Design a protein around this ligand. Sequence first.
Ligand SMILES: O=c1[nH]c(=O)c2[nH+]cn([C@@H]3O[C@H](COP(=O)(O)O)[C@@H](O)[C@H]3O)c2[nH]1
Ligand SMILES: O=c1[nH]c(=O)c2[nH+]cn([C@@H]3O[C@H](COP(=O)(O)O)[C@@H](O)[C@H]3O)c2[nH]1
Lengths: 321, 330
Amino acid sequence: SMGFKVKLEKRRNAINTCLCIGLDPDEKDIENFMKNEKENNYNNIKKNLKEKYINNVSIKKDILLKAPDNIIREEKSEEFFYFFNHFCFYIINETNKYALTFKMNFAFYIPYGSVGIDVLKNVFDYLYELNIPTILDMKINDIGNTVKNYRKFIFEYLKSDSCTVNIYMGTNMLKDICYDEEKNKYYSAFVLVKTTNPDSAIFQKNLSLDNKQAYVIMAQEALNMSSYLNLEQNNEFIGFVVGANSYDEMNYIRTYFPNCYILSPGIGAQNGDLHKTLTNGYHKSYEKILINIGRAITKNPYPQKAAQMYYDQINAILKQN
Amino acid sequence: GLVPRGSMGFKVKLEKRRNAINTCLCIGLDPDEKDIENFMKNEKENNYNNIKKNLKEKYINNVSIKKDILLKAPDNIIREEKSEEFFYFFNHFCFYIINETNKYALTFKMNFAFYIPYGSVGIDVLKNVFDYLYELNIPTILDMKINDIGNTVKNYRKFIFEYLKSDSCTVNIYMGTNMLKDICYDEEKNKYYSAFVLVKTTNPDSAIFQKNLSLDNKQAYVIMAQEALNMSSYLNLEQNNEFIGFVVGANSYDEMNYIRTYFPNCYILSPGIGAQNGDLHKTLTNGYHKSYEKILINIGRAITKNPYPQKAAQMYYDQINAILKQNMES
Ligand SMILES: O=c1[nH]c(=O)c2[nH+]cn([C@@H]3O[C@H](COP(=O)(O)O)[C@@H](O)[C@H]3O)c2[nH]1
Ligand SMILES: O=c1[nH]c(=O)c2[nH+]cn([C@@H]3O[C@H](COP(=O)(O)O)[C@@H](O)[C@H]3O)c2[nH]1
């Protein structure tokens, strides 16, 4: 209803941060949560059950509301579903007060087949109820007729606020991601611009047009497409993914597209330097520089304290600027 | 000297099937909501003729997900299993297309995008479709254009190659080629897998990065093709009977010619004929290789939206084969 641009601004006004918490649970995370809960008499699951919005998830709610002892004995074929969903609710419950947005990477929810997609749906439902801005990190790409299916999955079924998109095929795909002509609906996306992987230079920097490196050409074309679609007129936007370890490019992008929205993964697990990243990407409307932190929170044995410290650090750095 | 079903690299599986059926037709299975709806409507009007034929087929008993539901009488689904109706008709539409057309297919390509928009239910269908194709021993491609950093992309590898047991998938390597180490190789199991990387695509604005960006007067698509091959060599794929190949759009004649000229023995997958109207003779000729399986021609909607998909598939098979013969007798 309000539009992601407005959602982000309003939440930033309430919580005064740009922390984006990544929720990418792996098999080990789920297995560890199960083992740990069994050893501590299900303390975190019990807390989850006292939360109000658990009552508003779409998929197999009755299963999720059952006591763990009973799941294990009477609904054993749902055990993985139950512990996977409860791990997610546990992370969200422990950390949401510090989060401007949550980013869920689709790759983590698919490798078990359908079960993880039911978890992902419930996670999006839970975040929707909590009014927390969401990002689906799926790096979608295809021809127009095909990508409309991703638009439906992401923006209609999950009701995500935004997604990540790989526009190497071209920018016209965005017309079938960020806009629904039939319904007059508009949606936001972050396009891959400069990524964190060690060999990112190979195509993103080493290729060029008119003495500008590819990542610059790609950012400008994404903005051209945003203008064409009139997204910002409709309280939505196309933004850029710029790796937290990519200081020169972050500096270049913020200088040359002064009011762009940037999503920056790669701090914590991948060594990115938080001070340098946030400084090079800084904007006074700091929802425009989302700092994504995943494993440094989700693989930390004290996730609430980990989130708090990133919140506190970001806010100290934001203050300097 | 005989290898059993599932126990050989994709290079070998493709070669063997190409020797068997002598074509390069790749049938695309991309069912949309209209297709599923229309299938349900048509079956309801004809007392489920096609579903009952699906139910006769031996390997329907070998799929993993909800056989109890898939094997029910269709009027029982409608009356007694309302919440399973969409799952049942979606899955049966897919089995129907496969049963009707597989004898003409060198490979089936399933585009992930079509299986995800209803949430988990389409992933169950997708899993059953892959299980069914594996039982029939038909070469498979999961068209998902996956990309991420290595630690994340391993999850797609698990989904595609371990869960679905796909033979291959499509990959977008704009992030870098190092991601391929986590897709085409599993270091824990020492298993190798095949992929097609995006090189030149069919969308109208495909030149904007693929042709406009360059390094030293080589266009991006050429550099990306070369870097993919360099990674294949590093990973020893072809020594392990797997490969990294290229997606080159059916409509991209000049690029198809360059790629086949400069990488003579590469594997090419070519979508964009039929519903997207490329010139088949022109595409197949520019991409031709005497080992036909190196120039896969994908046809999806022109078969799956035809009311007689078996005959549509035979017609494309025959049309392709005639062009293959022209090249063989040139
Ligand atoms: O669009 C992207 N461009 C990037 O350069 C990049 N680097 C990491 N990732 C993804 O972000 C998350 C990183 O999470 P960690 O904090 O756990 O490393 C995970 O979800 C990763 O898949 C990227 N996504
Ligand atoms: O990797 C790709 N590069 C391309 O240039 C391209 N063009 C179309 N497609 C996909 O192929 C299928 C087209 O199916 P139709 O015969 O029904 O149009 C569908 O699955 C489309 O998503 C492409 N995939």
